[PDB]
Symmetry: C8
Subunit: 82 residues, 8 copies
């Protein structure tokens, strides 16, 4: 198992700190993103590409990834695939 | 045991962070959902399909899932 | 050991998050239930059936079960 | 080792969440009970019988048991 | 190792929750006792006997024991002696 | 596995306290840096060189490293 | 490894609860002691003898010991 | 692995409580030192010798060491 997960373009997240990884489509997750953007808890790791996963950490940080949600989770074991 | 659980579509939840997984059929759980919506703690992972399970995590996040609660808990092992 | 306990009708609780499971038979736990209801911390998982166990979690959530307390704790295995 | 201890009549307490288990025979503990009662943090698991143990958990819940402290702690196994 | 320690007359304390066990003689510990007595965090487990150890737990509870401090600690392994 | 990671020039970070390590190339991260600077929570470990990684720890400390994120995470071993 | 450490006389400290053990020879540590005294977080286990070590635990308790810091840390193993 | 690290002159820190060990060479860490001094969170363990490492603990304590950061982390073993 990987302690740090690559969420795209070299950016890393500690697996032990993730609560949930989800699609950005719905309105509750978009409110969460905007609240984080406003409280300075948002991390944008998409490197300009399109957001495909929103990672919520236990410290109310919100991390935007260009990698799809389950691919992020799969990377806990080293590949995009499980 | 999996540490991340697919709760429907590609949405993942860390199993260690779950307090309870329940059906949304009662007034108290509905109050919990509305409260989480209003405070920016709701996560909706149903992709529009009907809510079958409500997952309460430990940071007071509430996650709506389209999968039955018992099916969510079995995915801990596969 | 089961990490999630079935508390009736497919509703699940994480065993590690339980503080106490008790009968709903006393004034203090009923004050705990009504407080949870007013504060939006109550979870009713009885599926319309008697409350036979009150589960208090470490987040001040209060979960009503149709299964009796010792039965809940025995389903840990 | 049990994760859940039967504190009498099928009422369960999580052993890891217990701070101390004491007899209810002193003024400081009785104030702890009264405070818990007023704050909605008291749980009464004595099923109508005399209190022989007061269990303090880490969430400042206070749980009354009809079983003496030593017997509560011995049921960990 | 004992998970619950007998601090005298059947009263039990969880070993994992103790921060410190100390003699009651000095003025800083007596202030701690009186503050706990006033905030309802004091537990008197001496069963009327003389206080010989003050146990401080991680939740700011203060527990008075009739057993001497190192005897309390020794009881982590089952006897008054190590 | 190392408990402490060298983030450059002999500066050490505890691997278990890291939440995320990211590049400093986006507006949201730069605000995180500026907030940390104003709050006395910023640590600058770049020894005078360009920032290539921003490490967020669980105590909301923010630590600037002259080493890219992937290289920081790879030094766990 | 011991989980309880004799810090002098019969006074015990849980090793897992210690943040740091230092000599009291500097102004900052003295401020920490006075602050703990005033807030009811000081524990004095020196039995009057001179303070050789200051033990900062994780609930902001400060414990004065009559034993040298390094001697306190070796008693973790004996 | 050593549970306590000697940071110079017998002063000890618990390795599990360290967030980061860094050189005192930048404006942000000096703001962290002075804030700790004003708030009563500073611990000076240099024994009157140069500060060569600043150790930030998870309780917002700040510990000044005469030993260089990488040396502190190497004494973990």
């Amino acid at each position: 198992m990987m302690k740090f997960i690559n969420i795209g373009y070299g950016n890393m997240v500690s697996a032990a700190r993730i609560i949930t990884i989800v699609s950005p489509d719905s309105a509750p997750i978009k409110r969460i993103i905007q609240d984080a953007r406003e409280k300075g808890k948002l991390v944008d790791a998409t490197h300009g590409r399109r957001t495909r996963a929103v990672i919520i950490t236990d410290s109310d940080h919100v991390i935007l990834s260009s990698v799809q949600p389950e691919t992020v989770a799969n990377r806990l074991y080293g590949s995009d695939d499980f």
